[PDB]
Structure prediction request, 260 residues.
Amino acid sequence: KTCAESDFVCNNGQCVPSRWKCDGDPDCEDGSDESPEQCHMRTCRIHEISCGAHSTQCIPVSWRCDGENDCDSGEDEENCGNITCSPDEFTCSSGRCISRNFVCNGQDDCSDGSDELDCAPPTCGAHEFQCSTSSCIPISWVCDDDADCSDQSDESLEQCGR
Amino acid sequence: APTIIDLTCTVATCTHSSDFGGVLTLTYKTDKNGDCSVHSHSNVATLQE
Amino acid sequence: APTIIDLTCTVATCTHSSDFGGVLTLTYKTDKNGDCSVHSHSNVATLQE
Prediction:
């Protein structure tokens, strides 16, 4: 649903009306209409601090560096502590963050095999030929003059060598 | 092997001739694409495939 | 303060020793996360925190 011309668009895609802009109340989930820079400080309650811009958890400021891991990611023990990662990066068992493109890629980028633990292979059965559109069909359906794959990959000339 | 549930059959035309002269439509519900070994459990009717 | 609804108490294990020898679990549903002040309304059992 596209927001009407009379509605403001939050950064996350949410529609709010134009009267509700920099009026001080945290309307948008990300506080787009009240960007806490010149308008209002929208992110959660006043005496209340977030677990980061990527964690919607709200912990009271008394939980900031209070000696316990109040946040899910340990971001409460930041500055006075350590450890933070990225949404597009994968956290290994040792704590290293590698790019998600390296998860289940067949190489131990995590230095302990964590990115290779519980990886259902992107391929399909050994008795199977994978269509280039990722469809799994058994081998005996290749070069059968019938395009059982969605993109005629089972009948592709390159695979058949015809 | 795919698990097949709620399987029914209908006949479009029949003609008891020497050649293969009856066409059968079979409807079902499944989870994955695969191969099934199809059989008829009588000698009154012989399947082709 | 947070609001707690549908509170249920279960006991994991018990052993009436001089030290604290029972583990309690409370299950609930809340709207916002914060702090509560737990208490026991009897002197039969005394909580630790």
Remarks:
- The radius of gyration of chain C is 13 Å.
- Chain C touches chain A through three residues (CB under 8 Å).
